[PDB]
């Protein structure tokens, strides 16, 4: 049985502050 | 001379006759600040050495036939396993509490609550409750990224809907950590490079409820980083937690260092982080600001626990020192005013904590 993988949390910090 | 923390050596394990070859991750467990168990080999049958942390000078030694031993975090209740055979015993009443035999061998386990031991096998993670079915419920299957890893930790959020397994392995002359964060509600994992982690409950100002925070540290190829991300759906009426990602400082002579332990103080909203070479770091949970760093130990502190009487972290190193660090409750706001020069954090520390 394989585990179902996906994107739970975003680890990226943004390179622009769009406010 | 003002320090925002306070240090304590509780006990030295060589004073109790523990040989340092069994002071390691495989043989010494400390599921809370009340007990330490060590498996030994006096003669050819095994022994377990149970140390009461409130009477440290009178340890007891019972013979065992188990490959692991973990005391309950709050009572003198021991869980012992021999491959697939699992058993839980009441020590003082000499009473067997439950038993189960599995189909795959349990390679790693840990109490995640007062009633629940989480069981890890080679391909799945189970939860074995004391007050429940007596068959362990399967939570999730283990990801391919954690295969052939030494499993080092398992932690959950407070309501057990967010689960996290942690293993480490050696890739390209580096101790690379591989984590599997699992959500029970959506039934989906996420493979994450991380070294040490803990969940936390944080109330924001202007919020009626608490937010469930996931906190993890990592030393990857882009340096050391600490992330504080809210998991789960935020309740309506509460603002979402703004996502934090700050750097974890390592000195230039410690490029073979990496995080090994994390406890979070829920009273003071402070992340404690211990590295392999003995360095403790203190971060604020809300903003990620590194409050304090110091090398507290010369050997690797390999198992930690919350220290509830001081709301800190307690640990054992390979030498056998039982050491604790907590926030000095009188000094941490007079440290951030003068030494750290962060006045906006120091009085926002005062309203929610002091």
UniProtKB/Swiss-Prot annotation, chain A:
- In the record, which positions carry Phosphoserine? 2, 12-13, 19
Location relative to the cell? Cytoplasm, Cytoskeleton
**Processing after translation:** Phosphorylated in mitosis.
Function, in words: May be involved in p53-induced cell cycle arrest in G2/M phase by interfering with microtubule rearrangements that are required to enter mitosis. Overexpression delays G2/M phase progression.
Query: What is the name of this protein?
Result: G2 and S phase-expressed protein 1
Organism (species): Homo sapiens
Give the shown range, full length included.
706 to 724 of 739
Swiss-Prot record, chain B:
User: What does the UniProt entry list as the effect of changing residue 63 to N?
Assistant: Disrupts spindle localization
Phosphotyrosine PTM sites in chain numbering: 182
Q: Where is this region: WD40-like repeat 1?
A: 22-65
Q: Where is this region: WD40-like repeat 2?
A: 66-105
* Region entry WD40-like repeat 6, spans: 256-299
Question: Where are the annotated segments for WD40-like repeat 3?
Answer: 106-147
Q: Which residues carry this modification: Phosphothreonine?
A: 103
Location(s), subcellular = Cytoplasmic vesicle membrane; Membrane, Coated pit; Melanosome; Cytoplasm, Cytoskeleton, Spindle
The segment annotated Globular terminal domain runs over 1-354
Cystine pairings recorded for this chain? none
Sequence segments annotated as region (WD40-like repeat 4):
148-193
The PTM Phosphoserine maps to 65
Partners and quaternary state? Clathrin triskelions, composed of 3 heavy chains and 3 light chains, are the basic subunits of the clathrin coat. In the presence of light chains, hub assembly is influenced by both the pH and the concentration of calcium. Interacts with HIP1. Interacts with DENND1A, DENND1B and DENND1C. May interact with OCRL. Interacts with ERBB2. Interacts with FKBP6.
- Domains: what does the record tell us? The N-terminal seven-bladed beta-propeller is formed by WD40-like repeats, and projects inward from the polyhedral outer clathrin coat. It constitutes a major protein-protein interaction node.
The UniProt entry's sequence similarity note says: Belongs to the clathrin heavy chain family.
Q: Which disease is it linked to?
A: Intellectual developmental disorder, autosomal dominant 56: A form of intellectual disability, a disorder characterized by significantly below average general intellectual functioning associated with impairments in adaptive behavior and manifested during the developmental period.
Put simply, this protein is called Clathrin heavy chain 1
Q: Look up and give the organism this protein is from.
A: Homo sapiens
Gene for this protein?
A: CLTC
Covered residues of the complete protein? 3 to 356 of 1675
């Amino acid at each position: 049985p394989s585990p179902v993988v996906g994107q739970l949390i975003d680890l990226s910090s943004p390179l622009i502050q769009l406010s | 001379q003002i320090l925002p923390i306070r240090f304590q050596e509780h006990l030295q394990l060589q004073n109790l006759g523990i040989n340092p070859a069994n002071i390691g991750f495989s043989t010494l467990t400390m599921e809370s600040d009340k007990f330490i168990c060590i498996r030994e080999k006096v003669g050819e049958q095994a022994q377990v050495v149970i140390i009461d942390m409130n009477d440290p000078s009178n340890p007891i030694r019972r013979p065992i036939s188990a490959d692991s031993a973990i005391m309950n975090p709050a009572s003198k209740v021991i869980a012992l396993k021999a491959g697939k055979t699992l058993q839980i015993f009441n020590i003082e009443m000499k009473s067997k509490m439950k038993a189960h035999t599995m189909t795959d061998d349990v390679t790693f386990w840990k109490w995640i609550s007062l009633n629940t031991v989480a069981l890890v096998t080679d391909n799945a993670v189970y939860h074995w409750s004391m007050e429940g079915e007596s068959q362990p419920v399967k939570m999730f299957d283990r990801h391919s990224s954690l295969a052939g890893c030494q499993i080092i930790n398992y932690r959950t959020d407070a309501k057990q809907k967010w689960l996290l397994l942690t293993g480490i392995s050696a890739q390209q002359n580096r101790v690379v950590g591989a984590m599997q964060l699992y959500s029970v509600d959506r039934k989906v994992s996420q493979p994450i490079e991380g070294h040490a982690a803990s969940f936390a409950q944080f109330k924001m100002e202007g919020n009626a409820e608490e937010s469930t925070l996931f906190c993890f540290a990592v030393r990857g190829q882009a340096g050391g980083k600490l992330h504080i991300i809210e998991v789960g759906t935020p309740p309506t009426g509460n603002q979402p937690f703004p996502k934090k990602a700050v750097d974890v400082f390592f000195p230039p002579e410690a490029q073979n260092d990496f995080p090994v332990a994390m406890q979070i103080s829920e009273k003071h909203d402070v992340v404690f982080l211990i590295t392999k070479y003995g360095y403790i770091h203190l971060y604020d949970l809300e903003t990620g600001t590194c409050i304090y760093m110091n090398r507290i130990s010369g050997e690797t502190i390999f198992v930690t626990a919350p220290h509830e009487a001081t709301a800190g972290i307690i640990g054992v190193n390979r030498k056998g020192q039982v050491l604790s660090v907590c926030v000095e409750e009188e000094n941490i706001i007079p440290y951030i005013t003068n030494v750290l020069q962060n006045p906006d954090l120091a009085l926002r520390m005062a309203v929610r904590n002091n």
